[PDB]
Write a protein that holds these residues in place. Structure first.
Motif, PDB file in Angstrom:
ATOM      1  N   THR A   1      -7.181  -7.738   5.842  1.00  0.00           N
ATOM      2  CA  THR A   1      -7.742  -6.636   5.082  1.00  0.00           C
ATOM      3  C   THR A   1      -9.146  -6.291   5.547  1.00  0.00           C
ATOM      4  O   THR A   1      -9.500  -5.117   5.580  1.00  0.00           O
ATOM      5  CB  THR A   1      -7.711  -6.973   3.575  1.00  0.00           C
TER       6      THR A   1
ATOM      7  N   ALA B   1       1.474  -5.641  -0.647  1.00  0.00           N
ATOM      8  CA  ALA B   1       0.073  -5.716  -1.040  1.00  0.00           C
ATOM      9  C   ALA B   1      -0.478  -4.306  -1.219  1.00  0.00           C
ATOM     10  O   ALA B   1      -0.154  -3.401  -0.442  1.00  0.00           O
ATOM     11  CB  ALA B   1      -0.745  -6.472  -0.006  1.00  0.00           C
TER      12      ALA B   1
ATOM     13  N   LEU C   1      -4.183  -2.482  -1.581  1.00  0.00           N
ATOM     14  CA  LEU C   1      -5.542  -2.831  -1.175  1.00  0.00           C
ATOM     15  C   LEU C   1      -6.597  -1.863  -1.709  1.00  0.00           C
ATOM     16  O   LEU C   1      -6.470  -0.641  -1.564  1.00  0.00           O
ATOM     17  CB  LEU C   1      -5.672  -2.844   0.329  1.00  0.00           C
TER      18      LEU C   1
ATOM     19  N   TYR D   1      -7.338  -6.695  -4.519  1.00  0.00           N
ATOM     20  CA  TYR D   1      -5.978  -6.428  -4.079  1.00  0.00           C
ATOM     21  C   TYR D   1      -4.998  -6.990  -5.083  1.00  0.00           C
ATOM     22  O   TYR D   1      -5.310  -7.913  -5.832  1.00  0.00           O
ATOM     23  CB  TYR D   1      -5.716  -6.948  -2.658  1.00  0.00           C
TER      24      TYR D   1
ATOM     25  N   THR E   1      -0.771  -8.297  -5.013  1.00  0.00           N
ATOM     26  CA  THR E   1       0.339  -8.638  -4.152  1.00  0.00           C
ATOM     27  C   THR E   1       1.514  -9.043  -4.995  1.00  0.00           C
ATOM     28  O   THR E   1       1.342  -9.656  -6.063  1.00  0.00           O
ATOM     29  CB  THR E   1      -0.071  -9.713  -3.151  1.00  0.00           C
TER      30      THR E   1
END
Ligand SMILES: Cc1cc(/C=C/c2c(C)c3ccc(O)cc3oc2=O)cc(C)c1O
Ligand SMILES: Cc1cc(/C=C/c2c(C)c3ccc(O)cc3oc2=O)cc(C)c1O
Lengths: 116, 116, 115, 115
Positions: free
Chosen positions: B66, B100, B102, B107, B109
């Motif tokens: 990320t 995920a 973002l 974040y 998931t």
């Protein structure tokens, strides 16, 4: 294909199947007019709600019937529904995917907006 | 098709494209052995990481890069990566989608696990 | 003071109580060295992990033992643990809260960094 | 006392400050009647919305004016607002915290219901 709803279950790790979804559009008098409705499939997806002709500019509300989903599974959840309210198509037609990730006391929602 | 990674961008409302993903598997000596890697496509998806033969039981770590994603977009984010660590295939083969969503300082998931 | 961890349970709508949390600092050789640890309180919080003097710039990992949490509630979960990996940066705000919202097959995490 | 709203910003890693929040109660005719409102504080919190005496069982809606928040920061967002709709239930715990974590195209919300 301009509006699709995808729902996932964070308890099961699965699509959320058979989730009722009601879409409304704000009318000129500021009331919420019924626009389309349907149920998620075996893959947690709901296609075919509307058409590019019908899906004009406006303010739309996508009501995902989470309580009804969890109650049908014999679980007592917190929220009545998950509501997603947004202006659509005000720069011309777009394709919208509204996604939601459900837990009994929580949810996440996002949008994926694409220009065809 | 037993492992797929899907990444969305909550700032843009779009797939997260060109996100590097590294998968590791815990070895018998407890170290993290490199297992597979790849990049998300234009649709935010990464397919073809492994095969049902190769994807044996084990503890797997899916590292989603990320920081590298946000830095390539000229943004200074909080996390180094998003890590997803799970036991796989210990009741026989399953198909796993790791998703995920973002943001620069956050974040979400989830996993969707299906039995073929 | 400079680091707090807060953990919530999305199934029960509650703090996640008695969850083990381990903090590591990345060493020069890229290994993870134990730094601090504890268990969340009745409010789902873990205070007192470190001090301003000790919490120097660097990469840290917060590992939240979610698997044990769910199993103690009789629930089968997906993840081994939840991991949060970040750089502490002196130029930014001084107090870091790492928050996590847990479900059996999912989690959300955020950072609240303030002065 | 019985109802608190907490709002966080996932882009800046901060409380979401000065966000307008409106609470409504569902009336017998299914309309939404104004119930309480305010703006989040410097910690992203809104306290003092109601009292135990007033906060009877029923369906409530918390509307968080996210669009104005993002626009005041110079950012274009997706949603008009974030909506949280729930039933207050006397049999469950007495204090409700409604938390929301905001991004331009997404939000997360949870309830923390405790005694
Ligand atoms: C971690 C997390 C994941 C997702 C998943 C979104 C989507 C997912 C998971 C998705 C999966 C399969 C597919 O064919 C299309 C899909 O489109 C999606 O938007 C959605 C939310 C809100 C979230 O917080
Ligand atoms: C990852 C994530 C974190 C949070 C944080 C919630 C709360 C947080 C972060 C919180 C922090 C400090 C405090 O004194 C009280 C608090 O109460 C909370 O409910 C809330 C959501 C919805 C989420 O997805």
């Amino acid at each position: 294909c301009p509006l699709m709803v995808k729902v996932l279950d964070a308890v099961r790790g699965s699509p959320a199947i058979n989730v009722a979804v009601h879409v409304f559009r704000k009318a000129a008098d500021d009331t919420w007019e019924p626009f389309a409705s349907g149920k998620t499939s075996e893959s947690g997806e709901l296609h075919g709600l509307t058409t590019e002709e019908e899906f004009v500019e406006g303010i739309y509300k996508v009501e995902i019937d989470t309580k009804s989903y969890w109650k049908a599974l014999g679980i007592s959840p917190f929220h009545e529904h998950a509501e997603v309210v947004f202006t659509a198509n005000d720069s011309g037609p777009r394709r919208y995917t509204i996604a939601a990730l459900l837990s009994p006391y929580s949810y996440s929602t996002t949008a994926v907006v694409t220009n065809p």
